[model samples]
Structure formats: C-alpha cells, structure tokens
Target chain A: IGRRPSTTQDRISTVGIELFTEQGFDATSVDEVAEASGIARRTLFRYFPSKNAIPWGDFDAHLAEMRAQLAAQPDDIPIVDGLTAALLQFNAFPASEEINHRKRMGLILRVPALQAYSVVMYEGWRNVIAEYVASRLGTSPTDHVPRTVGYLLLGVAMSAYEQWLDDDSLELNELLASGMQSLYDGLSSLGEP
Target chain B: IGRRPSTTQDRISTVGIELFTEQGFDATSVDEVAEASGIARRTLFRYFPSKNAIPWGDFDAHLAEMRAQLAAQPDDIPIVDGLTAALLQFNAFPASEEINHRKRMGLILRVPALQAYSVVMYEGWRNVIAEYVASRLGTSPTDHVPRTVGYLLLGVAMSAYEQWLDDDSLELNELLASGMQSLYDGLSSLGEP
Candidate 1:
C-alpha cells in the first residue's frame, strides 16, 4: 500500500490519538486536540461529537464500506464465508495508517469511557452482520440464527484483533483466517469429547 | 435441579436485584439494599464491593466451582467438549432460582452501569475457559489458541443467553449445545462458499 492524502477527519483523529496516547485520555481535552490539529474548537466539535468519540475517526464511513462489501458479494455466497471475506477486506487498511489504527484501537480497548461508548458502535456493527445473514437465510435479522451469527462474527474479529495486538509479528489477515478455522475446528472436534 | 437453602449472599443478591429491578440502578442506593436485606450498609459493602456488582451474586464462588469442574475432567478429555459440559453445568440452577436468575441477568444486560462493570466478571469467566484449554494443550493461558477459545466460548454463551432472554420458551442448556453446534457447523461448512 502507498501513502495517500490524509483527509481532515484522518488528520484530526491522528492528532487526537497522539495526544491521548502521549499525555493520557483523561488529561487530554477537546480544545487541546482542536488546537493541536490547527482547527477551531467548533470544527473539532463538528467533526467529533465529543472527545470520547474522537478515537473512532469516521467509523461510520468504515462500517458503510463494509456494508457495501457485503452487498457486492454474490447472492449465493455462503453466509459466514461472505462475512469472513468482507471482514478481512474491511480491516485491510493502508500501511501508513497501521500505527494510528493500532493506537486508536489500543485506546478504545483500554479506556473505560471509550469501552462503554463502544457498545453503541458494536451493536451497529453486529446489526450489519445480522442483517446480511438474515438476507441470505430469508429470515428476519432478529431471528435467532442470524443474531447468533452476528455475535459469533464479532467475537471472531475481536479475538483476531487481540492476537494481532498482543504479538506484533503476527499478520492481521492471517490471524483472522486462522482464528476462524481454529474456532470451527476446535468446536467440531469436540464431537468426540 | 432442586431447591436448597439460600445462602446469605444469595438472599442479599436477591434483595438487591429486586430493588434494582423495581427502582432504576441510579435511583437505588446501596443503603436501600442493605436496609431491605436486613443488613447494615457496611455489611453490604463487605459482601459486595459496590452496587454495580450486586447483580452478579457470589460469582467468584461460582467461578471456583467451574474450575473444580474442569479439573475433575479426565486429562485426555477434548478441550471444547469439557468446556461445553462445564458451562452447561455452571448455568444450571434449581427451578426456584430461575426467575431470580432471569431478572438478575436482565438487569446486567440492560443497565448501562451494570453492563460496564460486567466486563470485569466476563474477563474472569473467560480466563477460566482459557486456563482449562491451556492446561489440556500444555500451553500458557496467554497462548493464542487458548485466549481465542476463551473469546469464542464467551461469545457462544452470550449469544445463547440473548436468545434465551428473547424467547422464554427455549431451554438454556439446549440453546448452548445447539449454538455450539451451529457455530462449528456454520464455519466449517464454509468450505463450499
């Protein structure tokens, strides 16, 4: 992957993450992030609803792209297979953004307020997966199977992220693919025990 | 499961759950639970560190029993199978406890503050699963496979709980067993996708 121009959103997010990581999330303020990013406080507020949300950095856009990826899949594609492929594609960020992404995720996972706020975002993400599975199954997204699939998909992604984050040498995509295999194989192999 | 004498911890938890269910968590103070349970405020604090943790009655004791359950399994038992059986056993309760347990879980799932605190409990529960798998595999609990299984096991249990909560007719054990099967089958069958 090659470097590209950073959008205003990306720049603000990067600046905000850098500040949070360096000083501390609680120590950092919206005004500080805005001032550091060379923007008026009003602009920063416009970009992110609050300081707690700054680390997310246009996650709505990323989620929308994932929705598009799922929609672009062939209608006959198996549900979990389509989801796994789309999930990997969604996480395939450019090399330049990797460090920022890591720091951003680190803050999300570590900070209490951020973790609480994340439930809102995570519900939306799981709904996307649920809706996709429902479409394939010709059932409602709220149906048991679809929603269960949603939770499983989210768990698989989170587990992969944890592994990747813990050991720097691990490739994310590889971790994701193998993680999925291990879960399925691990459970199926239980038929004996 | 059959009825048994309620421990002091259980009575306090039941009293607390009843109060939290009737009054909003924010509105219900610790003094009220202690008063309602016929115990001093200091005693309530002695039993539970905080109001948020009241919903999870004696979880540390429950977790310890689960560890014992895993340890009692044959060393050669398949990891996931052993986990599935223990998880089912861990969730089994006397019919008398079902209604209270349901209300307790409802509060934990719905209350924002309770949900935030539940992260701490969930981590401990997941660690139990991770440690079990680690021991069977002769690897550290921090190893990728064990940790990933921990996450997967938590996800499966959570998804089953959500389903059971949504539809009152489903048996919890049946849902868990079937959920595990569906997840494994769902992913492994991806070979065709």
Candidate 2:
C-alpha cells in the first residue's frame, strides 16, 4: 500500500468544497464529489457520511476536546470564563491550516443544507457547554439556564466565525475571546446597540 | 383541474410534513408528498421551492408579519420586552394547527439536514429581529450586538419549542415568553453551583 499522505482528508475536503462552492450544494451530486476526490463513491462515504458532512470532518473529536477542556477547569471558575477558554482551545488550529478551516467553515455556516446539517452537530456541541454550565449552576443540562447558555455560546462561536470569514485578516481566536468577553459582560447591555 | 382550495399551500405543507415525520425525512420524496396531497408534482413543486422547503410553509409571510408587529411596538418598549412580544406572536398559530406545527418543528430541529435548511429561514427570521435590535441599539443589523441578539433569540425560541414538544401540556407561547423573560432576567448571573 502507498503511504497515506498527511493531507488525505484535506485533499478530499478541498475538492469537495471547491465543487460545492462552485456549483451549489444541491447541484453537486455525490458522484461528482467522489470523482473530484479521485476516490470511489464508497470510499468517499467512508470519509464523510454524506455530502452533507464533507465540510465537518471529524467533529466529534473536536467536541470531545471541548468537553474534556471544560471538565478540567476548576469547579469554581466563572462558567463563562471556563467556556471561553474551552472554545478558544477548541478552535485553535495551526496557523498553517486556518485558510482550509475557514473554507470548510464558510460552507458549514453559509449553505442552507449545511446549516441544517450543523444543528445535529450543535446538539453534541451544545451538550458539552450545557453540561459544564449545569455543573456550575447545579442544574440539569436540559434545563433552561444551561440550555440557554449552550445555545448562546454556539451563537457567539458562530458569530465570531462568520466575522472571521467576512474579513479574512481577522483572527478567529481573538474574535472569539472578545465575543465571549462581551457575553460575560452581559446580554442586557446589548440594547444600546 | 379540480377546484383549488384556499389552504392549498397549507394542504401541501401538512401532507409534506406528515410524510417527513412518519417515514424519515431522507426516505420521503417529492413525488410521494405530491401524491399524498392529491396535487400534481408540478403543483407541489410550485407551492414549495423544493422538498427541503415543504416543512416550512409561508415562513417568510409569518416573518413579514412579525416584522410589522415589532414595528408597531411603542418606541419606548424595552428591546427584550419587544422581542418577547413579537416572538410569542410569531409562534402562535390556530389551535387546530398546533400539532402539525409541532411535528414540523420536531423535524426541523431534530433533523440535521432540515435544521441546516432552516438556517436560510433563520436568516430572514433573524434579520427581522436583528434589524429591530439594530434600531434599538443604534447599530446595524449585521453588527455584533444585533446579530448576537438574533442568534440568542433563535436559541430561545428553539428551546421553548423543544420544551413545548417535550411536554404536550406545555404552552408554546407561554414557554417562549418565559424563556425570553429568563434571558432578560440575566445571562451573567447564571453562575452558582
């Protein structure tokens, strides 16, 4: 067997996004993705469950890291601070990979089909944050407060990501830090615009 | 042609959602939805731009009405209060339609593909809230504060809907009103274990 290159998934995902970005998500069939990836359709499925999941890659791994990072924080730390820290850590990829990350993110956030696909991802992602928030608040993960926090953080993360993409020079981690800081400051203050 | 009823869009949407709910969404097709609705496939296609949209019927119409309602609010009303008022109204539907509405929401929130599809819907929905938020905050709709508020409110609405679905006896409007009230009560103070 030939040695698998480090960028195998990257190679496939890049081709996937290129086709998706060029032709639109629905217009690009799985056969097209497989052909573009230079792999069999079955092989492409092995990489991503569907064209819907191509941009996501191995999200569960990233999610687990977030959960672990949050769990590792001291029980008494401000929950938002713990959350901010975990989020920064979760999104911190090598500077070298930022462009590819952004490309995938663009598809995830912008595509109607993909945005729908991401709600499934958010359940787990939200659970991680909610569970941590629940631990701090002595509430259930599914309870209103924790759930709201989960939903809030996901928005903050998505907002930061969107802003990051809208202006390429923006640092995602920096935006995330600021976004979380704003939330930590308060949601009530947002009324003034 | 058979006489077209006033609720033709409603008829197509209900049948579409029913199929998506009964069988898995991916397993259901436009032809099946058309057949069940007793409409031609061309007619079904016309009502919904795509099968992806059948579960969401005339959402833009509801969103426009929401925008108008929010616009009618007294200028002095607090933004959160205004938001709560508008959202409660946006989610309200005929009592007869509640079960069908709940089923479609279940699929929208629960299905990854549909959830992504709904993001496009959220853009318009979020825009309605965000624009009003922008006006209140002295910011643009795309500004961080308004956008964050938009994202947060969607979460609030989704959480309330989920809860309403979870407990059949629970009221959707009441839960939404309460959920927004809780956020108004505070996001910063959620920190005691």
Candidate 3:
C-alpha cells in the first residue's frame, strides 16, 4: 500500500472530516471522500489505506508527540501529572473542537464495527505508550509495571472521553482531570504491594 | 444452544481434559470427546456447546467462589490481601495438581485461539471481581475507580502467570506471590491520593 505524503494526509483528513460530518461515517464512502477532496480514487487510496484510516491517520504522530513531551518533563514530576499534561497536549485539538469531535465520537461509539476497529487501533497505541513508560522507568519493554500503567492510562482516557460524550456539561479538561484524580485516589488507598 | 446440567458439565470437563491431553485441542473432535466420555454426540453438545467450552465451563463458578471468598473476609483486611487470598484459593486446586495443571496451562498458553477465548472469558470474571471491590468500598460498579481496580488486579494475575510460564526455576505459587507483591508495592507508594 502506498503511504500518505504528509500534505496529502492533511488534505484527506480535512475532506474526510467534512464528509464524516455531513453524511456520517457509516453513510460515507471512500469514493465520495475522494470526490469531495477533488482527488482520484487511486490518489485517495494512496493517502489513506481505508475509510477508517482517514480518521486515525494522525494517531501515531500524536502519540509520538505525547511521548516526547512526557519524556522531556523533569523526573520528579508525578507520573500522573506528566501523563495529564501529555494527555492534554495530545487531545488539545479535540478539546477545542469538542462539539464536532463529540459528534464524531458519538458515531464511532455507537457503531459496533467502528468501536471494534477503534479498539484494535488503540491496542497498537497502548504498546507504544508501554514502551515509552518502560524506557522512562528504566525497565524493559516487556516489564509488567509499564504495561499495566500504559493500559491503565489508556483506560482512564477512554473512560473520561466516554463520560464527556455521555454528558457535555463538564469541560473536557475537568472531566479528564477528575477521572485521573479518582484513579490516583483509589490506587493510593489500595496501597502498593 | 443446548445447556448442560452441572453434573454433566463436570463429566464433560474430565473427558475433555483426557482427550485434549491424548490428542490435542485442535485434533480432538467433539465426537471423539463424546466417545471417550461414553456420552452421545448430542449429549456432549448439551454439556458443552463446543470443544473449547469444555475446559472453560468452570470459569464462572470459580470466579463466583472467589468473589464470595473475598466478600467474607474481615473488613479490615487490605484490599490487596483479600484479592491475593482469592487468587490463591482459585489457584490452589491447580497448584495441588501441579504437574498436570502446569501442562494444561502451558497448552492453553501455547494455543492462540485458546488464549484469545480465555481473555474474553476472563473479562466477565474481571467484571465480577470489580463489582465485589466496588461493593466493599461502596462505589458504583460503573465508576472508573472500581473498573480500574478490577482491571489492575486482573492484570496482576495475568502478568504473574506470564512470568511463571517463562521461568523454569520458579514454582507457580512463588511467581504469583511475587507478582502480587510487586504490584501492591507499586500501588502502595502512592500514599493515599
């Protein structure tokens, strides 16, 4: 499969979002996306391997940026704070585009196929985050500590986002902050082994 | 799908293990299991909807027993200790049947299909454990705190098993104990959020 050039990826993402908003993910097709973007079918395929890829194209890049941001933070910063900052930075776009993104999230959450695919994609990001945490903690990538932390962090993010989707009353930042705080409090009281 | 009576489920489980050990999970057909167990094919289907179900039939019962065991513990017992006791009780039978059970565990670990199915099955058990924790702490089952703790505890079990499988020198109990210890130690350092 041909990889997307950075510029073309952005262009496809813009068109993809517009189509997704207009017709919804289920009703939209790759052909329609290509037509809307003024690109040939083959060209669109070159940029995104599938309809789903259009939306998820920047996931790796955003994850990489988040890792770098977290890694550069001082060693003494609590892991939770570092993770919160990284999450805020990574989701900054969605935070600003909360309403529209919430609409997209609604579509993804309600659609079983999309939800399964989203999980498959998220597992990849989970591994990446685990590796990053392992390196930061001076442990092997296969270490259980980093793997557990990584998955827990991802769970917090998903739970917070789901809460936001359920009720838009709380600001995204506050929702995430509260979720992370609750996790910290619960774990703290449980006391480490 | 035909359902099995409790007694029949146990009978099928015994035969299923014999057949699995003799001919392997993939090679042993339901017919073979029925023949070996002295049950008709249709009866076998009633007891176990499929070959894979035979080995996993007791999983829910085991989980329920663990939950009940945990709930009966003194209120002052640390959550981690309660969880540890539950796991130890669940693993006690297999630990007693060490050599044979270890072989079965290795078989399950080596088979990707079995591992996938096992994970899906355990998700249900994890939910039960989470609910037990939530009930003890007076938290909502749907809340992040309960769910996160549930997953964390489950992760600890899985991580320990994985470590035990890879280490020839360590006994299964030792591996599990160490895994639980390390996880609790990590969590304890948080010092009450």
TM-score of each: 0.92, 0.81, 0.70
Ranking of predictions according to TM-score: 1, 2, 3
RMSD values for the candidates in order, in angstroms, are 2.5, 5.2, 6.0
Candidate 3 lDDT over residue span B67-155, tens digit each: 77877888877776777777666766433456555555666656656664565576676777777777777777666556656666666
Stretches of model 2 off by over 4 angstroms after superposition: A1-46, A111-113, B1-7, B15-41, B94-97, B111-113
List, residue by residue over A131-168, the lDDT tens digit for candidate 1: 88787777898877777777777777777787788888
Residue B65, model 3: lDDT of 73
Task: Give the per-residue lDDT digits (tens) of candidate 2, residues B17-55.
Answer: 888889979999899999998989998877888988988
TM-score of chain A of 2: 0.83
Which consecutive 10 residues in model 3 chain B have the weakest lDDT in total? B184-193
lDDT of 2 by residue, A65-140 (tens): 6788788888867776787788787887786767667778889887766776677887889999989888777778
**Per-residue lDDT of B23-59 in model 1, one digit per residue for the tens?**
9778999999999999998888888998888889888
| Winner of 2 and 3 under DockQ | 2
Interface RMSD of each: 3.3, 2.4, 5.4
Best by DockQ: 1
User: lDDT of each prediction vs. the true structure?
Assistant: 0.80, 0.77, 0.65
How is the predicted docking of candidate 2 categorized under the CAPRI scheme? acceptable
Which whole-number lDDT from 0 to 100 does residue A164 have in model 2?
82
